[PDB]
């Protein structure tokens, strides 16, 4: 069934090249050469994770012979109230080694051995504010001891946590900020959702002024709402049998907010 093939396409996920993703990859390439620690900040629906995942899918692990994988960029995400053993455990697993029973000093000594030899240049920590305050001692230690850049990713709350400690606030002072879409940039992006993500049977013409007013009030410039509103509208359109989105069906979806 032709309809079923397309409904399975819309509920999925994709990475679209955008100016914010492209900016971050240029900036992180500057930090990875310089071995400088930094942080990435911005509001919760701006797409900081997808922009970092696209950077983890560049710079793939180089496998050779029977040596350990050469991993330039390590990306981890901590669990809530992450302790010192939880950080090492995840670093060790991501590099594909098994963790066994021991004490804190052992996870630490072992983490430094697998970080050596195996070619790490950058460590990216998502949701950095799940870290317990003491673990930052181990994050700084690595950054200073090994030529490894550490990147902390998070929301404005992260900085509220960081400002509680001078020692950390100064290693990670450099930052890049993710913003919201507006003006020509929001309008141009709506065409990319239409012509590259949705690909509906005939064109909905979402760049038209009345569809932009509906979309602007709905999305508030967040790429994580634009991706959500338009899938919800396109699924509703196709499962009701429409070849495109229209004023009333998009207002039905946007009224859920």
């Amino acid at each position: 069934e032709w309809l079923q093939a397309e409904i399975a396409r819309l509920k999925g996920k994709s990475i679209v090249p955008l100016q914010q993703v492209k900016t971050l990859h240029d900036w992180l390439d500057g930090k990875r050469k310089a071995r400088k620690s930094c942080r990435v900040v911005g509001e919760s629906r701006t797409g900081k994770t997808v922009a970092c995942d696209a950077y983890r899918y560049r710079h793939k692990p180089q496998q050779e012979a029977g040596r350990p994988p050469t991993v330039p960029v390590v990306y981890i995400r901590p669990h809530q109230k992450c302790g010192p053993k939880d950080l090492f455990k995840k670093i060790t697993e991501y590099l594909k080694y098994r963790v066994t029973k021991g004490t804190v000093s052992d996870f630490r000594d072992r983490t430094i051995e697998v970080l050596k030899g195996c070619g790490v240049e950058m460590l990216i920590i998502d949701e950095a504010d799940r870290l317990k305050p003491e673990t930052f001692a181990d994050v700084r230690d690595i950054a200073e001891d090994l030529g490894i850049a550490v990147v902390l990713v998070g929301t404005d709350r992260l900085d509220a946590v960081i400002k509680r400690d001078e020692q950390v606030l100064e290693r990670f002072r450099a930052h890049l900020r993710f913003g919201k879409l507006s003006g020509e940039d929001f309008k141009n992006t709506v065409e990319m959702w239409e012509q590259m993500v949705l690909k509906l049977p005939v064109s909905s013409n979402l760049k038209s002024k009345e569809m932009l007013r509906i979309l602007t009030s709905a999305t508030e410039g967040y790429i994580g709402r634009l991706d959500e509103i338009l899938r919800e509208a396109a699924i509703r359109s196709l499962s009701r049998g429409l070849k495109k989105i229209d004023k009333a069906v998009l207002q039905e979806v946007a009224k859920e907010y």
Binding site: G12, K13, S14, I15, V16, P17, D53, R56, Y57, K60, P61, Q63, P69, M192, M196, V197
Partner: peptide, 14 residues
């Protein structure tokens, strides 16, 4: 332009 399926990037990743 190329637009990536999110599950495909997972299948291709090391």
């Amino acid at each position: 332009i190329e637009v990536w399926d999110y599950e495909q990037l997972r299948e291709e990743y090391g």
